[PDB]
Write an enzyme that holds these catalytic residues in place. Sequence first.
Site, short mmCIF file in Angstrom:
data_model
loop_
_atom_site.label_atom_id
_atom_site.label_comp_id
_atom_site.label_asym_id
_atom_site.label_seq_id
_atom_site.Cartn_x
_atom_site.Cartn_y
_atom_site.Cartn_z
N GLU A 59 33.60 18.39 -55.23
CA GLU A 59 33.48 17.15 -54.45
C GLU A 59 32.58 16.12 -55.22
O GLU A 59 31.58 16.60 -55.99
CB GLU A 59 32.70 17.38 -53.17
CG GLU A 59 32.71 15.97 -52.29
CD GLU A 59 34.18 15.50 -51.78
OE1 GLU A 59 34.46 14.64 -52.74
OE2 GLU A 59 34.68 15.64 -50.91
N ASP A 87 35.47 21.44 -51.71
CA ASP A 87 34.02 20.96 -52.22
C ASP A 87 33.17 21.79 -53.17
O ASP A 87 32.64 21.02 -54.06
CB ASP A 87 33.19 20.74 -50.76
CG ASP A 87 33.76 19.50 -50.00
OD1 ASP A 87 34.22 18.79 -50.35
OD2 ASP A 87 33.72 19.88 -48.72
O1 LIG Z 1 33.67 12.11 -52.48
C1 LIG Z 1 33.49 12.36 -51.29
C2 LIG Z 1 34.65 12.33 -50.38
C3 LIG Z 1 34.51 12.52 -49.22
N1 LIG Z 1 33.20 12.75 -48.69
C4 LIG Z 1 32.99 12.98 -47.15
O2 LIG Z 1 33.66 14.29 -46.87
C5 LIG Z 1 34.75 13.77 -45.94
C6 LIG Z 1 36.03 14.82 -46.16
O3 LIG Z 1 35.96 15.50 -47.32
P1 LIG Z 1 36.27 16.79 -47.39
O4 LIG Z 1 35.20 17.22 -45.98
O5 LIG Z 1 37.51 17.08 -46.72
O6 LIG Z 1 35.62 17.35 -48.23
C7 LIG Z 1 35.20 12.62 -46.89
O7 LIG Z 1 36.11 11.90 -46.20
C8 LIG Z 1 33.91 12.05 -46.30
O8 LIG Z 1 33.58 12.06 -44.82
C9 LIG Z 1 32.19 12.90 -49.36
O9 LIG Z 1 31.17 13.16 -49.27
N2 LIG Z 1 32.44 12.84 -50.67
MG LIG Z 2 35.86 17.68 -50.51
#
Ligand SMILES: O=c1ccn([C@@H]2O[C@H](COP(=O)(O)O)[C@@H](O)[C@H]2O)c(=O)[nH]1
Ligand SMILES: [Mg+2]
Length: 177
Positions: A59, A87
């Site tokens: 991430e 992540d």
């Molecule tokens: O670089 C990022 C991209 C997403 N998110 C958070 O995580 C959500 C979903 O990411 P994931 O839970 O699918 O990793 C993102 O839409 C946002 O809510 C982040 O913290 N960093």
């Molecule tokens: Mg992610």
Amino acid sequence: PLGSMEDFVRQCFNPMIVELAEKAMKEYGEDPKIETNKFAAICTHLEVCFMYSRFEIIEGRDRTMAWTVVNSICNTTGVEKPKFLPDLYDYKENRFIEIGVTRREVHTYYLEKANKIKSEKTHIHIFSFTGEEMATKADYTLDEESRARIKTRLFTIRQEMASRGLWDSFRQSERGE
Ligand SMILES: O=c1ccn([C@@H]2O[C@H](COP(=O)(O)O)[C@@H](O)[C@H]2O)c(=O)[nH]1
Ligand SMILES: [Mg+2]
């Protein structure tokens, strides 16, 4: 008074976090100035990933670098390649991890995430702004102390939002992905 969520975000998250969160949003046609509740959720999830991480962070990286790192791991090791970018990678347990931070019911969010990724190998660990958590196979990966520090930071964020009149809307605005 009701404050500005953009102003809260820029002042109460680390700038490296904010910048990475802006990139993430600009990349998907969302404007951090407009979708500010999402902007805050994105920063929060980023901070949790960095707190949680033994671990390779996925991430936050440019998508090209992120997939390069994922593919690099999948063939230094032999772990199944995920269909969606995760992540983190856990070198101790030899598995990718999806991290969730939700303002909804943790079970709801957990299964949404399970149903999206359709993986029998990727670990899922969900945190709520309530202190509730849920992790795959009731394997919580980190020790009590490390997870309590995460949950404490979530309480600080929530209370800081409340201070500025931001929590009400933030808490009510999460939709399914
Ligand atoms: O670089 C990022 C991209 C997403 N998110 C958070 O995580 C959500 C979903 O990411 P994931 O839970 O699918 O990793 C993102 O839409 C946002 O809510 C982040 O913290 N960093
Ligand atoms: Mg992610």
